[PDB]
Amino acid sequence: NLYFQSMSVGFIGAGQLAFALAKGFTAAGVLAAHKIMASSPDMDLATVSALRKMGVKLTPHNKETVQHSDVLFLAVKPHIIPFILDEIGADIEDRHIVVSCAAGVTISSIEKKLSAFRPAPRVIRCMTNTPVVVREGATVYATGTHAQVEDGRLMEQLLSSVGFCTEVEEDLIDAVTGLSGSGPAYAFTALDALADGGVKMGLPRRLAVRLGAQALLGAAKMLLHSEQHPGQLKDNVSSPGGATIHALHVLESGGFRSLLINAVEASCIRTRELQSMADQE
């Protein structure tokens, strides 16, 4: 609905997240690759080589990225953000929307640094995940103190092109990190294990990987397109005395559900802990 074929996007950081978003945005056709600039500390990653081939402009100077861009994604380690903010703070102009993707880093900490330079920085905090690279990401965002109303709409329009996107209150983002931020790693672990189980029972490894991934994708899509509770879908597919209900019993006996709860909790708690350590420093 918004015309942003003239919009320039910059990434500070040229790692996994910058590649994933840039590949997703250009695959969606919402951004031309030549309108994307990325800056990296080391021009020796495979990520910067793939970005170069996409047509993304690459530079070693964070200041160049700032001057080129309208929307500026900060995709660096959480503990690097306060060094980037001190570096680029004077170059932030009124046109800029600063989008922080660093886990744990609060809007208040970013606005505090940038406000020392120019008084009303437009800041958005987001938590996205690597599946944006195949345009099936899960993203949430929260708008900062000086973010205008169209800033949030622009950001939802941009991130919706590469997956699910919705606005949340900032105090939910650490929990989202433990669920959909870390979620793909839980799935990769599960898929590796499911493939081992297929191999134990006689399947070739390549087929077992394909079938397990297709099973997970189809089940996830079923749930997304259904109004039904996941327990109801579980109920619908477990015939009496059959193979599936026998397998569900052995999952329950090992406390499978509790492990996944433990995981979301552990990732969320670590996210809160990393930020608390940063605020102390």
Ligand X SMILES: O=C(O)[C@H]1NCCS1
182 near its own copies (CB under 8 A): yes
13 near its own copies (CB under 8 A): no
237 near ligand X (CB under 6 A): yes
Question: In the range 47-86, which residues lie near its own copies by CB under 8 A?
Answer: 77
243 near ligand X (CB under 6 A): yes
Q: Which of 197, 230, 242, 255 binds ligand X (CB under 6 A)?
A: 242
Q: Which of 32, 160, 210, 278 binds its own copies (CB under 8 A)?
A: 210
254 near its own copies (CB under 8 A): yes
Amino acid making up residue 102: A
Applying CB under 8 A, the span of 2-10, 108-116, 145-153, 264-272 interacting with its own copies comes to 264-272
175 near its own copies (CB under 8 A): yes
Question: In the range 79-108, which residues lie near ligand X by CB under 6 A?
Answer: 103
Q: How far is the CB of 160 from its own copies (least distance, A)?
A: 12
253 near its own copies (CB under 8 A): yes
Q: Which does 121 bind (CB under 5 to 8 A by kind): its own copies, ligand X, none?
A: none
**Which residues of this protein are in contact with ligand X, per CB under 6 A?**
103, 177, 181-182, 237-239, 242-244
Binding-site residues for L-proline sit at 170, 243-244
Binding-site residues for NADPH sit at 14, 16-17, 40, 42, 62, 76-77, 103, 236
